[PDB]
Amino acid sequence: KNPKSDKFKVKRFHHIEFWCGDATNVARRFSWGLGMRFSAKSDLSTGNMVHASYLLTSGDLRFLFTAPYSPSLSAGEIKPTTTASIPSFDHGSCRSFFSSHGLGVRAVAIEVEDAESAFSISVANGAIPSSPPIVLNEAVTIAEVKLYGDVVLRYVSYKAEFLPGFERVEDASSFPLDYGIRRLDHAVGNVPELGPALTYVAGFTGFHQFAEFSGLNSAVLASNDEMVLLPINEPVHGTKRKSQIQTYLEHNEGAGLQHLALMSEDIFRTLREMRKRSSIGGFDFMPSPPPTYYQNLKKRVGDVLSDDQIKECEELGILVDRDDQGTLLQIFTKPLGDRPTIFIEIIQRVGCMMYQSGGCGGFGKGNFSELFKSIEEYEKT
């Protein structure tokens, strides 16, 4: 059931912003590793004396990488005279974030009809304000509320190219990389206590629980058309193998964003391209499931995927799970930086055609059991 109870009009995921120590090096690594193009910049060469911000795009996916300059460059500025292109930015908040959590997501940004009203309504409904609505060049409005930990939910609305004050990047520095990634499917938070986190976020958004069907409990919040998907996890304590949610909270110094799931229009090509680059500057992937997992795929999805397509999943280490509505292919990277905290998921969904409805196939929860049974069977051989 979908009660469609959004308290404001929400469109789609707009962008994800990483707070970094050096935005240049993170952005160049991610660009090569994920096949994203340099699309826009706001830095010293555009008159920004406050922060360096570089935007990568692939299809509709937008990754923003921001780091602070020396405060000395902007010491004479005040907020009314700021050269920052993102007015919510603050040197002290950014350094403290990165000092505390390491490299990670500061902002999950969604495009809304009216960022000011979304902010007003959210705060009227319990959201903790982080940055009030600010209108950029009479053209774009941006506002922020606390989501969990030090992550903000950022609202953006356009009267009618990323943000005012950003410049298009020179063609020569913009190499048209593309490994098939097209959009953000969902963004996942880790918290110590799922209940209060859910109540808070669903409280101020009107997002509803999205129906599902070790080491965690989780629930997914969704917008009216279920294209904005915000799962949240808590750990399950005192188990056998220590909870990876608990490991996250320890190394991250508390709650924060756990993984970003990026939809590919051709997950075979995406993973071929990402895996060729894993050891030359790109991203590493979790160890592949054993061959027993792929033998078991015939009985589970043999009607969806041919044997050759299954052998292709085996080559690339792809996981497969299935709903009552659709089928999903997925794989997880190793952590994106030094700490065992944030990682990336690549996802492609089969089914639920009407366009494709969101969450088609679910989120792969059945793969914990399947991989475990596969592990037992592989030891048996």
Coil vs helix vs strand at 287: coil
Q: Which is nearer to Co ion, 40 or 198 (CB)?
A: 198
CA end-to-end distance (rounded Å), the chain: 44
Taking the complex as a whole, the smallest distance from the CB of residue 261 to ligand WI0 amounts, in Å, to: 6
Q: Which is nearer to Co ion, 136 or 352 (CB)?
A: 352
Q: Using the rule CB under 6 A, which residue among 332, 356, 357, 375 binds ligand WI0?
A: 332
- Residue 367's binding partner out of ligand WI0, Co ion, a second copy, none, with CB under 5 to 8 Å set by partner kind: ligand WI0
Phi, psi of 281 (to 5 degrees): 110, -10
237 is in an annotated binding site: no
DSSP conformational letter for 281: T
Candidate ranges 7-15, 77-85, 156-164, 358-366; the one touching ligand WI0 (CB under 6 A): 358-366
Q: Provide the mask over 217-256, with x wherever binding to ligand WI0 is found by CB under 6 A and - wherever it is not.
A: -x-x----------x-------------------------
**Which residues face 141 on adjacent strands?**
135, 157
Question: Measuring CA to CA, which residue among 205, 198, 204 is closest to residue 231?
Answer: 198
Q: Any contact of residue 286 with ligand WI0 (CB under 6 A)?
A: yes
d(CA 257, CA 252): 9
Residue 175's H or E segment, with its range, is none
Taking the complex as a whole, the smallest distance from the CB of residue 341 to ligand WI0 amounts, in Å, to: 10
What tokens does 183 get? 């959009």
Q: Which is nearer to a second copy, 100 or 357 (CB)?
A: 100
d(CA 176, CA 128): 40
Sheet of strand 167-168, all strands in order from the earlier edge strand to the far edge: 129-136, 140-148, 151-158, 104-112, 10-19, 61-68, 51-58, 37-42, 167-168
259 is in an annotated binding site: yes
Q: Any contact of residue 367 with ligand WI0 (CB under 6 A)?
A: yes
Among positions 200-219, residues that touch ligand WI0 (CB under 6 A) are 218
Q: Do residues 201 and 219 make contact, with C-beta atoms less than 8 angstroms apart?
A: no
State the residues that interact with ligand WI0 by CB under 6 A: 186, 188, 218, 220, 231, 259, 261, 286, 332, 343, 345, 363-365, 367-368, 371
Known binding-site residue numbers: 186, 259, 345
State the residues that interact with Co ion by CB under 5 A: 261, 345, 363
